[PDB]
Design a protein around this ligand. Sequence first.
Ligand SMILES: Nc1ccccc1-c1cnco1
Ligand SMILES: Nc1ccccc1-c1cnco1
Lengths: 205, 215
Amino acid sequence: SMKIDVVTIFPEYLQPVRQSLPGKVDVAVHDLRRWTHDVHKSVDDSPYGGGPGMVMKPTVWGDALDEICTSETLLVVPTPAGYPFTQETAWQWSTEDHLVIACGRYEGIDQRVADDAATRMRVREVSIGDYVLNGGEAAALVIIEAVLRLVPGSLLEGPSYTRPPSWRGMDVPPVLLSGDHAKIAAWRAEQSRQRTIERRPDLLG
Amino acid sequence: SMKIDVVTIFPEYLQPVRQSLPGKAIDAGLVDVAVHDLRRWTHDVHKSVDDSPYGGGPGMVMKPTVWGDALDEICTSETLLVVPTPAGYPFTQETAWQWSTEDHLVIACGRYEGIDQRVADDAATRMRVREVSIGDYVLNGGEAAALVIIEAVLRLVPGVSLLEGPSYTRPPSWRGMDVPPVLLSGDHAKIAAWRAEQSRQRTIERRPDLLGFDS
Ligand SMILES: Nc1ccccc1-c1cnco1
Ligand SMILES: Nc1ccccc1-c1cnco1
């Protein structure tokens, strides 16, 4: 049984993932503006030390996490400056009772929010890849998907084929129709080797 | 002006593209994003898009016939066909910059155990095709990757190294935690330096690979 709370100023981004799950795991989405202070519902402010963009306010985020998090919570913060989120990470988090995902803008959440939370609960700042998003919402979607599909409920993969055996002048590799399953395995292994060399030589060292 | 077509068996799942950066870009007319139900190109009553794999293995493979018809209608020779897949070349910031100047992106979202390889092979005889991974984690399908790609690319469209260090804003003291004094000093040189040192610490600790170190 896993509970996921997402906090975001774009709550509608996450509805189409909440309404996708089967046997209700529970996924709840919260509008950050619930915890604003002022009639203007301000969530960000100018960065100390100058610079472009805006930093998300610690007083707002602090109130939101205070309400939603407990000592058992794993607080996940998608950020370009995060540790890499991997399948290993997904496996670890799949056994957790409570994930809270804090979605911020690219510019960031005041660092004191995470630092303060970390004195009471486990906090994980994570990046899903080396590209820049405008905010953490899309990364939250990726994390939610990768984690939840592992909830009870190396080399690259090579090419796959299905019917028909011949399509637009291209035949399915005859070995796959051979009924020689040791040979098929060996062929697939060689396809995986070639593809890993070509596309992901980093995986080979 | 850019056109993005997304083809998926879950068109409703691509509706998050309607807010945030992408939504604003669409509203401002800098991009048009159209989502297509793959099952529109089926002809049987059960609208079957998948079948069991040749050679054996777990799960199902998406049929080339349906994809071929869909891509025939949506793509031209100028199209950049994007296929998210765990076995793809890495999608990076460099890729996002490159695709940001494209006139037409078509994103094919796969489900089950993948799309028959001949779909990509056939398309490549007629247009540029890019199979890409957005990271080494396993998704159920290409839909979430499409959303990531769209966001990363659209924020670079005209009109729309080292890790970033910590950022701070008001108030200067919060829960007994103070903003680093150097940031309040207005000394642009000392601030630039502190920020450089923070990023170094963070990059070495979290992403040593960026600086050419192990793990
Ligand atoms: N660029 C970002 C901006 C804001 C929140 C997360 C990210 C992110 C996470 N992984 C890659 O990018
Ligand atoms: N795992 C997947 C399954 C289907 C379509 C894309 C992916 C993917 C791409 N990059 C990471 O995951």
